[PDB]
Amino acid sequence: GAMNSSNYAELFNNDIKLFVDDTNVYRVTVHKTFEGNVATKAINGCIFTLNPKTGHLFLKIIHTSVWAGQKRLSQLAKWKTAEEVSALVRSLPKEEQPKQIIVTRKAMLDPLEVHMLDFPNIAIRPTELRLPFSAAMSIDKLSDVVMKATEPQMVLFNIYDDWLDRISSYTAFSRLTLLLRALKTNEESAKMILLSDPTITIKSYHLWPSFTDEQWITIESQMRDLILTEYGRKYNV
Amino acid sequence: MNTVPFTSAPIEVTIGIDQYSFNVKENQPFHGIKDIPIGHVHVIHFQHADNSSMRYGYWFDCRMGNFYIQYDPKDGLYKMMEERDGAKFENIVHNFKERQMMVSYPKIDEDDTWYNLTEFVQMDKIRKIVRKDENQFSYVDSSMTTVQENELSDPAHSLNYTVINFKSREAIRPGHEMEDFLDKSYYLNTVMLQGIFKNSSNYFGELQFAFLNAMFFGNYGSSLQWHAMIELICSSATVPKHMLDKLDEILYYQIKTLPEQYSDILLNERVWNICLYSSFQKNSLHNTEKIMENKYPELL
Numbered sequence A: 001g002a003m004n005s006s007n008y009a010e011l012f013n014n015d016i017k018l019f020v021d022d023t024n025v026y027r028v029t030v031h032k033t034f035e036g037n038v039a040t041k042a043i044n045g046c047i048f049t050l051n052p053k054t055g056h057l058f059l060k061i062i063h064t065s066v067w068a069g070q071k072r073l074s075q076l077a078k079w080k081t082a083e084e085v086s087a088l089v090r091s092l093p094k095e096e097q098p099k100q101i102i103v104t105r106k107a108m109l110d111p112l113e114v115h116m117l118d119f120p121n122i123a124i125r126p127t128e129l130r131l132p133f134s135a136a137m138s139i140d141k142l143s144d145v146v147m148k149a150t151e152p153q154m155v156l157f158n159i160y161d162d163w164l165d166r167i168s169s170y171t172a173f174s175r176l177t178l179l180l181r182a183l184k185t186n187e188e189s190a191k192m193i194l195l196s197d198p199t200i201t202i203k204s205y206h207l208w209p210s211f212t213d214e215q216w217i218t219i220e221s222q223m224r225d226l227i228l229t230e231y232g233r234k235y236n237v
Numbered sequence B: 001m002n003t004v005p006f007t008s009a010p011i012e013v014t015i016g017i018d019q020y021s022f023n024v025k026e027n028q029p030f031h032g033i034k035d036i037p038i039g040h041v042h043v044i045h046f047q048h049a050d051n052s053s054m055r056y057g058y059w060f061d062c063r064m065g066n067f068y069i070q071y072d073p074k075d076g077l078y079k080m081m082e083e084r085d086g087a088k089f090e091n092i093v094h095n096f097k098e099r100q101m102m103v104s105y106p107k108i109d110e111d112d113t114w115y116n117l118t119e120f121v122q123m124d125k126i127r128k129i130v131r132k133d134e135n136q137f138s139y140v141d142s143s144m145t146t147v148q149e150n151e152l153s154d155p156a157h158s159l160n161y162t163v164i165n166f167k168s169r170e171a172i173r174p175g176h177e178m179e180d181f182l183d184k185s186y187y188l189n190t191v192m193l194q195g196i197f198k199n200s201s202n203y204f205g206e207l208q209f210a211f212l213n214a215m216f217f218g219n220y221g222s223s224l225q226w227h228a229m230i231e232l233i234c235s236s237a238t239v240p241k242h243m244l245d246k247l248d249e250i251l252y253y254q255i256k257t258l259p260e261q262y263s264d265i266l267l268n269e270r271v272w273n274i275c276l277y278s279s280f281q282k283n284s285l286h287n288t289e290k291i292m293e294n295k296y297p298e299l300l
């Protein structure tokens, strides 16, 4: 069934599972035409497929060529997402295939169920959590690989860097969602928090800075302050 | 015109014959139904006065044998039986008719309702949905489950309607996932019509039989099948024109026939709103839309 706060620890058990977020698959800018009508221009997107236990991120880059000459693109984007997730599952060895796929948006349920008919034992589930995975394109190295792509491409990342050497998956996912929520709420301030100290760098093979345990505590507090600050600005509290 | 005599009527019961019904009192001198129109299937159905649980009944065709009803006090129901002795049967009917112990099938001459509801319904197809090969007539009741309902429990007592499932490998060609899910034409035309049913007449016959079992017995699985077969057509972009026009007629008379007060339990809002207002065929069912809009506007 649906995944919520009551069954949250299930994300970190030993049954392989993936979150699939489709919010950055079909990305457009809207603009005026010479005649004063409005048109869209697509930009490259991505499917965000994440194992919350291990941090493995299967970033399938969606190149704008896949939309060429197609109609009803927002509908097609859901089906293309489900096609690519299905292809990913088929590409994995049996013992790496997920037992559950959790979609962050309920509109993905039917497209994914239909593409996964050959896998009747993989449960397709919605979630009641509001997850900030749309903000994945605020992570500079992910945004860069998506924008530079000239063709469809899959790029593998560990979205937790090396954090699991020191903290549990539950804590790593909590840190990830806090960082992404902060980047979604006020991207400029969140990035300023993450880079404010030149002496802390991002390793070539990492996405986030190399903070010590104590610095992560400070950073996490600053991210919570940002989220609360923005909440007060929004609602005049 | 043919006759279904009753040996007797020992328990008070509402008896239906097709769309007609009448009440019989405990031990009333009722000995059957005469003047039944040859050329159609018929259904004789029962709801006991002391226990409205289990509506049940029998589909039959008087061209296939001489049938009568006799109450069984052990199993507690009116049973259809076949009489193989022709002269015995004729002599029974004649005596009961001479003593005017029979009701007459009360068909108005202008009235094509029953033909319109059973146009494509054949006894041979009924006997394949309802499997009891030793009788020429078919028993159905309010509680019988369908093969589909069971998969999701006594298989000898099931309604073997054709399984329709929009999220199944049968309905979705590998590699045509979006296409086949959003446009069910493959599933309708190749899988169902060309493959399983062979032609539209058999498809409509099953659709009509499912409606009738839903209406006369309150059989929930039959209502599910009726709606699924409507939705499969309406959700297909490519349907032969003759089928769309025939479907409009079929549904019109079913909507013409349904008890105004049973609409809440026999009509699926989602299916009907989808079919009339969103589907590919939203503009192909003018007669059905007109009656649905004027008779049941709440549901919509």
Ligand SMILES: COCCOc1ccccc1C(=O)O
Pocket (backbone or CB within 6 Å): B255, B256, B257, B260, B291, B294, B295, B296
């Ligand atoms: C005996 O049922 C009454 C029919 O009720 C209707 C109401 C509005 C429009 C059409 C009908 C009809 O079936 O002609």
